[PDB]
């Protein structure tokens, strides 16, 4: 063991660096596309002349962008009062995008009050937070990182572009490595889980029956190492945890964790290329 724990920890550290680079790339892709949507001719045309015809052109464009990019669960334009005016929804499982006529007043949401505080054409983002409809949680639960940009015409604010980056999709895309056979969990700065192969530990800050699933409660002596935002590992005698930190469209850290119990560690002793084949 001792050496096998260590060798596994070294592999997991490589995996954490790999996956951190993938999130950094996703962030660059989101920054670029948010800037293009906020400066787009189709949106400009609609805001100048919000005819049904121009709304259709905008909706078709956003639906195309959602199908092409996959990581936006919604793309919306809210007016200055916080009422949704344009709302494209995308479902990654089916690949269907299209507009909804279910348009709500979002003015009570904190992410909206934050967007109002931004300058014209300034792109910023809200912390990861579950989606809601009329204040009720959307189920299945939907953690979103909302990109926010007030949009102006001749210096007069028209509303806000809002893009909901779908953390469940990104987790599904990024957080399992078939070659190294590792699952990466995402743990927020507050200690609660927003992605895991174990669904039952998610969102303990929101779901009462899960409030025990905080990394700081689970691994009190390992938590400080994670909070340091350095990459490293710790082994408690029962779990090997390898950890790293990134900043993903946020000034707060997001911690990426590979947590393997003794039982799981024993088995990768067996690992052979023939195991990878071909699944
Ligand atoms: Cl709401």
From TrEMBL:
<protein>
    <recommendedName>
        <fullName>diguanylate cyclase</fullName>
    </recommendedName>
</protein>
């Amino acid at each position: 063991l001792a050496n096998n724990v260590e060798n596994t920890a070294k592999e997991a550290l490589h995996q954490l660096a790999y996956t951190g680079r993938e999130y950094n790339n996703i962030q660059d892709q989101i920054e670029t596309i948010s800037d293009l949507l906020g400066h787009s001719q189709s949106l400009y045309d609609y805001l100048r002349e919000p005819s049904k015809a121009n709304l259709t052109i905008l909706e078709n464009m956003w639906s195309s962008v959602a199908r092409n990019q996959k990581l936006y669960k919604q793309i919306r334009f809210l007016d200055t009062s916080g009422t949704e005016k344009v709302r494209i929804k995308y479902d990654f499982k089916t690949s269907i995008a299209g507009p909804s006529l279910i348009l709500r007043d979002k003015s009570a949401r904190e992410y909206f009050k934050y967007a109002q505080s931004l300058d014209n054409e300034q792109i910023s983002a809200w912390g990861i937070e579950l989606e809601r409809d009329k204040g009720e949680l959307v189920y299945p639960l939907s953690p979103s990182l909302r990109i926010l940009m007030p949009i102006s015409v001749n210096d007069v604010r028209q509303g806000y572009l809002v893009l909901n980056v779908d953390i469940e999709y990104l987790s599904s895309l990024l957080n399992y490595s078939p070659v190294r056979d590792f699952h990466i969990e995402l743990v927020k700065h507050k200690g609660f889980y927003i992605a895991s192969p174990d669904e039952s530990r998610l969102y303990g800050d929101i779901i009462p029956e899960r409030s025990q699933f905080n990394f700081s409660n689970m691994y009190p002596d390992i938590w400080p190492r994670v909070v340091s935002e350095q990459a490293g590992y710790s082994y408690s005698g029962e779990h090997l945890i390898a950890f790293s930190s990134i900043k993903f469209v946020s000034n707060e850290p997001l911690h990426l964790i590979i947590d393997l119990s003794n039982e799981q560690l024993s088995k990768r002793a067996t690992r052979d290329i023939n195991d990878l084949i071909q699944e």
